Design a protein around this ligand. Sequence first.
Ligand SMILES: OC[C@H]1O[C@H](Sc2cc(Cl)c(F)c(Cl)c2)[C@H](O)[C@@H](n2cc(-c3nccs3)nn2)[C@H]1O
Ligand SMILES: OC[C@H]1O[C@H](Sc2cc(Cl)c(F)c(Cl)c2)[C@H](O)[C@@H](n2cc(-c3nccs3)nn2)[C@H]1O
Lengths: 133, 132
Amino acid sequence: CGLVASNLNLKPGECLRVRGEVAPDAKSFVLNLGKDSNNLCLHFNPRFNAHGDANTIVCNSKDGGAWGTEQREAVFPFQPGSVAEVCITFDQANLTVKLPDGYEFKFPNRLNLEAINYMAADGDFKIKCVAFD
Amino acid sequence: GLVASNLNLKPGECLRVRGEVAPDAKSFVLNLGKDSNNLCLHFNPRFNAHGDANTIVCNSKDGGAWGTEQREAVFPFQPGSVAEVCITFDQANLTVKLPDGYEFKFPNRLNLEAINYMAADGDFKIKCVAFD
Ligand SMILES: OC[C@H]1O[C@H](Sc2cc(Cl)c(F)c(Cl)c2)[C@H](O)[C@@H](n2cc(-c3nccs3)nn2)[C@H]1O
Ligand SMILES: OC[C@H]1O[C@H](Sc2cc(Cl)c(F)c(Cl)c2)[C@H](O)[C@@H](n2cc(-c3nccs3)nn2)[C@H]1O
């Protein structure tokens, strides 16, 4: 139900910046990147209290519609109600995610896409702006 | 160019779009509406295209059919430059604010509850989009 954008043509090394406001009663939110809705090089899913987890970032891939292996992070710099900006870039080996407090983590590049063409937002986060390199 | 959907832009809300006009630009397009066949605003600055030079052409599209064109008398765009446009609407008009602060109105002929669809085309690369 959040924004869906296509034809992004984000190349390796280029930065996608997304700013939004976390809902005051947020359970979780999602940013999806990839080729299309069924082929995601990154599903980024901060969980405040959702899907079994509390204050945990869960990332995954999706390939031909099938979820890959989950990856959980050790940090959670989100707060209900607060503005948050996330920055994402990739190379052939990994995506690098930069979180609102400057913390960076890597997620393996599983799909080998030439470019990221698709983004989508969902859950308890209102997008305020998106910047493309 | 970029296509966005599920924008849920409500009356009174501002959409800001910043992009790069190509150095050899002929024209560019920003479309807003419900879907590609139902546009409350087709915003088409023509440098040299479609018969016009340095002219903004606007139109609507309804069930795939173009409406009556409107042309502006000012052209604050330059090839090979960054350009920003800001758009809002109410039931009567869309209001477009151009890079030099010039504003004009375009009648709202579809009376959509919300703008859900945006697309860019031609010689413009979107760099940033904001919703406030
Ligand atoms: O791995 C990422 C996913 O985990 C589970 S499904 C699942 C569960 C298990 Cl135990 C797994 F082993 C695998 Cl591989 C997947 C979520 O339900 C999914 N999810 C959240 C959401 C939204 N959250 C807010 C708006 S939409 N939409 N889909 C996704 O985050
Ligand atoms: O009115 C808006 C349009 O005018 C003509 S069609 C037209 C012509 C006349 Cl004489 C009319 F009386 C009417 Cl009602 C329509 C353009 O060809 C269209 N157009 C531009 C473009 C692109 N330009 C860059 C990339 S895609 N793709 N379609 C559209 O701008």
